[PDB]
């Protein structure tokens, strides 16, 4: 005997919405990416018309709070679909060469710290668990070649 289980602690997650485990949500890809898309887009508008009433209004409250801390949404630098803006030098997430030459762990700190001149730091805006969700959503923008 030893690991009587293993005392690793409780998992950090995002905000709780009543009646729907947030800890669980943070490991279930379809839940975490729904919250990543909300953060990414700055609205609840592109969310599946199947979204529940409680969900759609919890997201809005999340956004409204973030709007008071001058949070700037990811889309529209990077667009709703990726592959940003050459003008602004905003990264194109659809590109496979950009995707292969980034690890997901590495990507994290570039969102936390910001990246050179224009891409802003998000360490005081978002939690490290909300950055993890966004790294996962950006992964799904990849196209071939």
Partner 1 sequence: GGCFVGSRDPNETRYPKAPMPLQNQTSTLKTAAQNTPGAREAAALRDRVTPLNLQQVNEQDVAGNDPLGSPARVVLDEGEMYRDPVEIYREGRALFQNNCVGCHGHNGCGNVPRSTNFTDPGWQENNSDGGIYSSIYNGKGIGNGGGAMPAYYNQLSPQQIRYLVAYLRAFKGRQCNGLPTLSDVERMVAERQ
Partner 2 sequence: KRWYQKLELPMPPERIFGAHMMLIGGLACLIGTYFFASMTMWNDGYVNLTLRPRLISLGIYDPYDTEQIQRVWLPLIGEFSTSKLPFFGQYPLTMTDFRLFGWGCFHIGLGLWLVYAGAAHYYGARGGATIGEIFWLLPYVPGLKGLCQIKWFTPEGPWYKVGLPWGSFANTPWPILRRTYADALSPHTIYIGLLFFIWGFVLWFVLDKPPVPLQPAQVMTPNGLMPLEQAPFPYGWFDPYLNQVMHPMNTINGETTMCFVWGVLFVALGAYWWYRPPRSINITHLEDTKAVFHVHLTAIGYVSFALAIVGFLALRNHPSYLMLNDMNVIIYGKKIVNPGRMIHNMITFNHVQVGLLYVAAGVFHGGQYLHGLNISGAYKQARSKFITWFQNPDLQTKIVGTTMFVSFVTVVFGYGMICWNTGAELDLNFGIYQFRSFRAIQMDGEAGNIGYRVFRPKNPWDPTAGGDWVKNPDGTAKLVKARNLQVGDRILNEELGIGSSPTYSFTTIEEINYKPEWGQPKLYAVQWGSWTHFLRKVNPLFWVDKGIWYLQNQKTFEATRKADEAYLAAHLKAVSLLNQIDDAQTEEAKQKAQAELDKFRPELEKAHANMLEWNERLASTPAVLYSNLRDQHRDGEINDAIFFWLMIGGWLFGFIPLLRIAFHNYQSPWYRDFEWRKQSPDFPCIGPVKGGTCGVSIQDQLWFCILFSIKPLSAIAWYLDGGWIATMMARGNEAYYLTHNISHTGGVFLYMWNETTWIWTDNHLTAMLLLGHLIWFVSFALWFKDRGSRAEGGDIQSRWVRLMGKRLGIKTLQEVRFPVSNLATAKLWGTVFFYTGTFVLVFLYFADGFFQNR
Q: Which residues are annotated as a binding site for heme c?
A: 74, 77-78, 98, 103, 110, 115, 119
Query: Is 129 within 8 Å of 14 (Cβ atoms)?
Result: yes
Find the part of the chain contacting ligand HEC (CB under 6 A) among 22-30, 52-60, 61-69, 118-126. 118-126
Question: What is the DSSP annotation of 107-126?
Answer: HHHHHHH-BTTTB---TTTS
Closer of 79 and 129 to partner 2 (Cβ) = 129
Site for partner 2 in 97-126 (CB under 8 A): 109, 112-113, 121, 123-124
Q: Which does 81 bind (CB under 5 to 8 A by kind): ligand CLA, partner 1, ligand HEC, none?
A: none
Which of positions 65-94 make contact with ligand HEC (CB under 6 A)?
Answer: 72, 74, 77-78, 88-91
The only residue of 79, 99, 102, 127 in contact with ligand HEC, by rule CB under 6 A: 102
Residue 85's Cα: distance from chain center in Å? 19
* From candidates 32, 59, 122, 133, binder to ligand HEC by CB under 6 A: 122
Instruction: Tell which one of 73, 127, 136, 142 touches partner 2 (CB under 8 A).
Output: 127
CA–CA dist 140, 138 (Å, integer) = 5
Residue 16 has which token pair? 């709780």
Nearer to ligand CLA, 2 or 10 (CB): 2
33-69 exposure pattern, b = at least 16 Cβ within 10 A, e = fewer: bbbbbbbbbbebeebeeeeeeebeebbeebbeebeee
In the complex, the residues that contact partner 1 under the rule CB under 8 A are 86, 89, 91-92, 95-101, 103, 105-106, 108-110, 113-119
């Amino acid at each position: 005997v030893m690991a009587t289980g293993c005392f690793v602690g409780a998992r950090n997650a995002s905000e709780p919405r009543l009646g729907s485990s947030s800890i669980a949500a943070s490991r279930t890809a379809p839940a975490y990416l729904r919250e990543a898309q909300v953060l990414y887009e700055g609205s609840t508008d592109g969310l599946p018309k199947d979204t529940p009433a409680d969900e759609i209004a919890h997201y809005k409250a999340m956004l409204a709070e973030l709007q008071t801390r001058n949070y700037a949404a990811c889309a529209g630098c990077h667009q709703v679909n990726g592959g940003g803006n050459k003008a602004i030098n905003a990264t194109n997430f659809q590109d496979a060469g950009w995707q292969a030459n980034n690890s997901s762990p590495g990507m994290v700190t570039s969102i936390v710290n910001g990246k050179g001149k224009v891409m802003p730091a998000y360490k005081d805006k978002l939690t490290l668990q909300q950055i993890n969700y966004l790294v996962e959503y950006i992964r799904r923008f990849e196209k071939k070649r």
